[PDB]
Structure 1
Amino acid sequence: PRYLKGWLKDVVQLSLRRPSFRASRQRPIISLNERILEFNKRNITAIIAEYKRKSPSGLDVERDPIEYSKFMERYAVGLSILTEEKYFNGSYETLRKIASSVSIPILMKDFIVKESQIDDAYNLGADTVLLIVKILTERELESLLEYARSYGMEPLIEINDENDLDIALRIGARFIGINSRDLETLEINKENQRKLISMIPSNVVKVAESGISERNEIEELRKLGVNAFLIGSSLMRNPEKIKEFIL
């Protein structure tokens, strides 16, 4: 991984020693980026609903993962499930139970730094994974991207700044997540996010991430060319909001 400080250094160390999960995979892969594209074609707002019990920025909600997922399944283009254990209170068991209960695409959200984690995602039932440019070196990112693709997954590659985007573009990313929140400082910057979105090639599927709680923010982002929206906190606090968001 890259030189890291603070909580990011810690979570990455936890990931390096994350035990692998052995399981047989039942359902074939359902492409999330292709489903986003077809929702775009049919003019339906594409929301990736995220499930997370806790977050380092303060979230702490008790809500049944299965019921939440089955409800979101009626509206969402896909689901994002946190499997990071220490800061997000996620687990592989949760991803496994959800994957067996819904039939929409599932993105496994964690801090992926080694190939076994992608093996875990595949064996657990996930359809794709998140790769974060800011914690990986360019060689690592390229290997992991190639590795995810060998399972037929197109990973969501997350950028937070211009240097992240140069790397993402250089390694041939086709599915990019623009995170308005800096993982290191936990600071949100809507403006920097807008600038980055505007620099991205039109043929890349773009997913806006973090801090979205209002339908107008979605409408604005959509006019900037964003294809999908990853929403977690506002939906965990109020699942019903999904009905306002897809109008």
Structure 2
Amino acid sequence: PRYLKGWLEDVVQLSLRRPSVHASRQRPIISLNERILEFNKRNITAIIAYYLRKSPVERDPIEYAKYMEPYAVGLSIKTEEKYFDGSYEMLRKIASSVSIPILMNDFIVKESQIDDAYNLGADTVLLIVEILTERELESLLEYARGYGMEPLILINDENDLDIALRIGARFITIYSMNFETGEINKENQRKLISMIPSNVVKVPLLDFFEPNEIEELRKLGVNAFMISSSLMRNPEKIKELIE
């Protein structure tokens, strides 16, 4: 990884030394990017329900996963420990108790964390341009693919987009986030969406969504929407979205 500052470097250092787990998965991968493409063809609104317990309305992660299973295209499960109160064991039990795709959402800096995700039952992993060099991102990209997991590449700005496309990313999440504040820059997010090629599956992160926003973003080529705060506070809004 890079050498950063602040809590993000603390997290990078935690990831560097995180021990690899002793586990094996219980079902095949269920491809998240492919399921999004299927939902698009079938005209089903594709929502990734984003779960965290803490960050820099706390919910039971199992119960949340089961609640979202009938409606969501996938689940994002935060497995970073110190700042997000994530666990590998919670990932494992979520992945063995729902049959929709699971994104392991963490700060991946080494291959053994990808091994961990596969062995715990995740269907894909997040990779973050900001914390990696291009060479590192390319090597982790190809590592994840090898398992059958098209990773979701996180971009926060145009430089990040350009690195992602330079290494052949096929699945991108547009956070447009300042990790120091947890801000999503909605203006920059729209700009970045408009720069992504049509054959890359593209997923903005939204805390809250406006009436018309989902429709407007779909008109910009968005394939799925990863929604955090609104669904944690009001999980029932996923019904409205799909129905």
TM-score (structure 1 length as normaliser): 0.95
CA offset at residue 87 of structure 1?
1.0
Q: Which runs of 5+ in 2 are unaligned?
A: none
Q: Any conservation in 2 of the 1:180–1:211 contact (CA below 8 Å)? A: no
Given the alignment, which residue of 83, 87, 90 partners 1:87?
A: 83
- 2:135 pairs with 1:139: yes
Aligned residue identity for 1:167: I
Match of 2:55 in 1: 55
Match of 1:22 in 2: 22
CA offset at residue 210 of structure 1?
3.3
Q: Any conservation in 2 of the 1:133–1:158 contact (CA below 8 Å)? A: yes
- Matches of 2:218 and 2:126, distance apart in 1: 22
1:55-134 to 2 correspondence within 5 Å? 55-56=55-56, 61-134=57-130
1:189-228 to 2 correspondence within 5 Å? 189-228=185-224
SS in 2 for 1:235: helix
CA offset at residue 151 of structure 1?
0.5
CA deviation digits over 1:194-236, x for unaligned, max 9? 1110011111100111323344322221111110011122111
TM-score (structure 2 length as normaliser): 0.96
- Matches of 1:164 and 1:177, distance apart in 2: 11
CA offset at residue 33 of structure 1?
0.2
- 2:29 pairs with 1:42: no
Q: Any conservation in 2 of the 1:46–1:229 contact (CA below 8 Å)? A: yes
Aligned residue identity for 1:144: L
Q: Any conservation in 1 of the 2:24–2:121 contact (CA below 8 Å)? A: no
Q: Any conservation in 2 of the 1:215–1:245 contact (CA below 8 Å)? A: no
- Matches of 1:48 and 1:244, distance apart in 2: 14
- 2:228 pairs with 1:232: yes
Aligned residue identity for 2:191: K
Match of 1:168 in 2: 164
CA deviation digits over 1:123-170, x for unaligned, max 9? 000000000001100010001001101111100011111111111001
CA deviation digits over 1:19-74, x for unaligned, max 9? 11111222011110000000000001100001111122xxxx33221221111001
How many percent of aligned residue pairs carry the same amino acid? 87
Match of 1:12 in 2: 12
- Matches of 2:129 and 2:208, distance apart in 1: 22
- Matches of 1:189 and 1:121, distance apart in 2: 29
SS in 2 for 1:199: coil
- Matches of 2:194 and 2:8, distance apart in 1: 28
CA-based RMSD: 1.2
Aligned residue identity for 1:102: V
Q: Any conservation in 2 of the 1:130–1:157 contact (CA below 8 Å)? A: yes
Q: Any conservation in 1 of the 2:157–2:176 contact (CA below 8 Å)? A: no
- Matches of 1:133 and 1:215, distance apart in 2: 31
CA deviation digits over 1:100-119, x for unaligned, max 9? 10000100000000101000
SS in 1 for 2:58: coil
- Matches of 1:82 and 1:232, distance apart in 2: 11
SS in 2 for 1:150: helix
- Matches of 1:189 and 1:157, distance apart in 2: 17
- Matches of 2:211 and 2:8, distance apart in 1: 31
